[PDB]
Design a protein around this ligand. Structure first.
Ligand SMILES: Nc1ncnc2c1ncn2[C@@H]1O[C@H](COP(=O)(O)OP(=O)(O)OP(=O)(O)O)[C@@H](O)[C@H]1O
Ligand SMILES: Nc1ncnc2c1ncn2[C@@H]1O[C@H](COP(=O)(O)OP(=O)(O)OP(=O)(O)O)[C@@H](O)[C@H]1O
Ligand SMILES: O=c1cc[nH]c(=O)[nH]1
Ligand SMILES: O=c1cc[nH]c(=O)[nH]1
Ligand SMILES: [Ca+2]
Ligand SMILES: [Zn+2]
Ligand SMILES: [Zn+2]
Lengths: 694, 146, 49, 48, 40
């Protein structure tokens, strides 16, 4: 592997049909016999690993101990028609036969799998690198054909991206994707987060911030994988292990608790359907359930108590699953605005930003980057803005002891961490918690869950308060949230057009109160008239309450103007009220809901069209790539896959900096400087070498 | 075929075969596809209507019970909201189909201590149920056409 | 897919589909790895015929 | 009708240069080419 | 017409030719059925 890594270093910044690439192909041909033996070593033990797991191999396994004899191994292996005569004999030699010719095939299959993985991957990278930079060499495909199983085995782990490299040219980078990283990326909640991010950027995002937003999404996604790993499952110590186990249980099953809370609400309300009011006990009235079973009244008590408990676990589960991401995102943005903008050093937001003003509380706290990983942002800000604004002023703002910086670099102290609850009491950062809770209490999802708390407790006061929890289906089912979004999309217009309806009706009220008061007798009695327009407040209430809801307008309710001196004036009163209010203004409400359905639908279509017609990374359209058959499908899956850019960043973060290659160091340096020029924009490997590749 | 066989048991079962024009006529099939395109959304919005009407029924049962006397008789009142099930049926049956909502059917609240509360009740019922939700249904149909 | 299991071992599985040798192809393709006798049992084939 | 007019104006501004009329696709060959072209090269404010 | 509408509306570029070949085979079978049921 160390020899191959040196060979790969010779290919850094290598163009298609380069001198070094074609020289390295010559060396492999010169040692073709040895290379084939190396390749035949890996495929023999890769094939062996899957063969022993096959059912056909298990047929020959007859020994109860789980072993197989050499003569039985011989007849089992050649029955698979995958090895030659000598190859089966070689495997017999490698098998550790006892004095009884008894073979332990379980350990035999796994003996060389782990040791040969690192070299096997680098051989796959080397052959892939050469095959893509010397694409017209006949002497190279035989190695590729002989390494077909090696290449096939490492295909899911061979990540490749393209960057605009140090040489002002598009370069292709090959790296390793770990099994855990791919497995976590394929998790259903991570995929849903990706879809939400893709929709936001394509729909309401700009091209200038696209890569900065994408990297920030990668960092947030990386943090979520850490949370998912922690909550996953395989006297103070006795309680602590169970407490974290309990909290992780709530975090893992947070959405099942949300579903069970919704089901608990429907069950309660179905019982509430049987409520009845009667004067007799089961001048004040009694409310009681009406049933013959007798089991429903105690059931409501049990269901009500259970519902409050489940909703409580939702708040705890939310605080352990979603809150850390919220605090991480807020700490991350504050840290970068401190360093790359000097928020509270230079600009000093002017009290109109509750987000910027509330973040002043955490600057001097000792535990400001609690969730955000960069625990040295205060050091970096001091080194960047300390000289021009004053080191002692920055240290005061960020709560840093300047005398303690050197001693930490001098040596490391190992104090006594006493496992006592008393010593834990003063170890909490009060000012940070007050800042953190203000961030949590301004989170919409937490506030909704907190609202779900208050109603649930109030349900024990009066069981009819549990009806409010039936509104959870707006958030419970994603479909209903889509229809409800078609109402709140033009919500600011909906309220305004209602306010316009209030003004227009008021003008009609003014006219009626001055000219048409005779027609507002709503009493069939002849001695006690019920004047509805002898007062402006009564007349205005009348027009809104009965005039708007009437099908034909105000003319439906007030008295018939037939044979009156103001007949023609009153008919104009009515058909204008009917046309403006009932016909036109209500049409505006209907049109706004209808328009939002079309507006939201095309947003989905626009996102799905942009994704399928342009590359998310480079921005080159599908028409250019489709010149080669299936060109756009290959480009988005292998060349400019946005998942591989996420995988590369995780690969860079875990890799030791002293082990970074020249290309990895180049990208890592630019990432640390928040410079995104390494992302290919308007260019790609296929375009740069159009002459050589074609 | 089963409906045709039942038509011999009762000739009025042959009326079901009149529905065959949905698939026999391509124009009718397209028009009905313009309804079934958003069928899940239509069912969901009907369920949402049921939920909001249930909430209004709960409010009426708790506070506005005295206004649900649907009997012109004076000594035997037909109270429609003395039971929660009866009140919910009354709402879903008459308030939804009324032009101005439930306030068209229930008693006039003029000169009462809960007058403003009840007018807010009626106006919000009319706006949310009669206007907004039915508008949602018709908009779903129009959007399916488009 | 669960209902299609009933037709695998039937003697007349490709009654309408023209390829009457699909069982032979599947055997020649997967018998070495998963057992010729097991594949024949799955597909209702007589190896001696 | 009014909504698409707003969108068409917004789409035309972000996809073409107000002065020369060359589309954003040509300028985007250089990274952030259209953003630079409309801010420094053919800025309509600079013509004012 | 139905096949063309289906592929152009809710089809991808990677599956297009396979879907077209499958449609061709189904059309070939329907031609045999029509010839069988045809009377002289
Ligand atoms: N740079 C890019 N990286 C990835 N996909 C891209 C890129 N540019 C455009 N796309 C488009 O994104 C679409 C979504 O990706 P794709 O469907 O292959 O993902 P998946 O992981 O298989 O799952 P899903 O179907 O849920 O998206 C693809 O059809 C592809 O055309
Ligand atoms: N010749 C041009 N000059 C200026 N802007 C142009 C030109 N051609 C196209 N545009 C587009 O006009 C848009 C509006 O300009 P821009 O948003 O940068 O202006 P601003 O002064 O920062 O403020 P605002 O966001 O209110 O427009 C830009 O996004 C740009 O893409
Ligand atoms: O995810 C991580 C961890 C450490 N440093 C980073 O930049 N990112
Ligand atoms: O249509 C046909 C008939 C036989 N074989 C095929 O491949 N196709
Ligand atoms: Ca090194
Ligand atoms: Zn690309
Ligand atoms: Zn220009």
């Amino acid at each position: 592997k160390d020899m191959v890594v040196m060979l790969l270093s010779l290919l850094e910044g290598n163009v298609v049909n380069g001198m070094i690439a074609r020289q390295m192909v010559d060396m492999l041909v010169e040692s073709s016999s040895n290379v084939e033996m190396i390749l035949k070593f890996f495929d023999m033990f890769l094939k062996l690993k899957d063969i022993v797991g096959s059912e056909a191999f298990q047929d020959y396994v007859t020994d109860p101990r789980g072993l197989i004899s050499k003569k039985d191994f011989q007849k089992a292996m050649d029955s698979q028609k995958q090895f030659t005569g000598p190859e089966i004999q070689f495997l017999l030699s490698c098998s550790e036969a006892d004095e009884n010719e008894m073979i332990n095939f379980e350990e035999f299959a796994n003996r060389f799998q782990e040791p040969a993985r690192d070299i096997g991957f680098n051989v796959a990278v080397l052959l892939t690198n050469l095959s893509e930079h010397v694409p017209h060499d006949p002497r190279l495909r035989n190695f590729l054909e002989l390494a077909e199983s090696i290449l096939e085995y490492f295909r899911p782990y061979l990540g490749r991206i393209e960057i605009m490299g140090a040489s002002r040219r598009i370069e292709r980078i090959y790296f390793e994707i770990s099994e855990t990283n791919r497995a976590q990326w394929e998790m259903p909640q991570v995929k849903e987060s990706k879809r939400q991010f893709i929709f936001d950027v394509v729909n309401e995002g700009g091209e200038a911030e696209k890569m900065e937003l994408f990297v920030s999404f990668c960092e947030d996604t990386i943090f979520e994988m850490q949370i998912a790993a922690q909550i996953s499952e395989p006297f103070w110590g006795e309680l602590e292990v169970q407490r974290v186990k309990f909290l992780n249980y709530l975090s893992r099953n947070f959405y099942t608790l949300r579903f069970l809370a919704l089901f608990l609400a429907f069950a309660i309300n179905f019982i509430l359907l049987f409520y009845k009011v009667s004067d007799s006990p089961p001048n004040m009235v009694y409310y009681f359930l009406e049933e013959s079973t007798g089991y429903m009244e105690p059931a409501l008590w049990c269901l009500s108590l259970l519902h409050t408990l489940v909703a409580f676990l939702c708040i705890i589960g939310y605080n352990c699953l979603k809150v850390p991401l919220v605090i991480f995102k807020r700490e991350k943005e504050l840290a970068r605005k401190l360093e790359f903008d000097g928020l509270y050093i230079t600009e000093q937001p002017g009290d109109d930003d509750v987000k910027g003003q509330w973040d002043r509380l955490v600057l001097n706290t000792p535990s400001f980057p609690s969730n955000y990983w960069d625990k040295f942002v205060k050091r970096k800000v001091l080194d960047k803005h300390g000289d021009i604004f004053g080191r002692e002023r920055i240290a005061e703002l960020l709560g840093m002891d300047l005398a303690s910086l050197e001693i930490t670099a001098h040596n490391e102290r190992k104090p006594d961490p006493p496992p006592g609850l008393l010593t834990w009491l003063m170890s909490i950062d009060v000012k940070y918690q007050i800042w953190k809770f203000g961030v949590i209490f301004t989170d919409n999802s937490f506030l909704y869950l907190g609202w779900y708390m208050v109603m649930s407790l109030l349900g024990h006061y009066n069981n009819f308060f549990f009806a409010a929890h039936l509104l959870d289906i707006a958030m419970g089912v994603k479909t209903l949230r889509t229809i409800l979004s078609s109402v709140t999309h033009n919500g600011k217009q909906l309220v305004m057009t209602v306010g316009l309806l209030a003004v227009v009706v008021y003008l009609y009220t003014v006219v009626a109160f001055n000219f048409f008061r005779k027609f507002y007798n709503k009493s069939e009695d002849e001695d006690e008239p019920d004047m509805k327009c002898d007062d402006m407040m009564t007349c205005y209430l009348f027009h809104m309450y009965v005039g708007v809801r009437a099908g034909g307008g105000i003319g439906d309710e007030i008295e018939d103007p037939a044979g009156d001196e103001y007949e023609l004036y009153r008919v104009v009163f009515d058909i204008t009220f009917f046309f403006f209010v009932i016909v036109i203004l209500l049409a505006i409400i209907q049109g706004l809901i209808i328009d939002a359905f079309g507006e939201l639908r095309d947003q989905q279509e626009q996102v799905k069209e942009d994704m399928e017609t342009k590359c998310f990374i480079c921005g080159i359209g599908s028409d250019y790539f489709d010149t080669t058959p299936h060109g756009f499908e290959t480009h988005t899956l292998e060349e400019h896959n946005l998942a591989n850019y996420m995988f590369f960043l995780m690969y860079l973060i875990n890799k030791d900096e002293t082990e970074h290659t020249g290309q990895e160091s180049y990208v890592w340096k630019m990432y640390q400087e928040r410079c995104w020029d390494f992302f290919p924009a308007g260019d790609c490997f296929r375009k740069q070498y159009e002459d050589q590749l074609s």
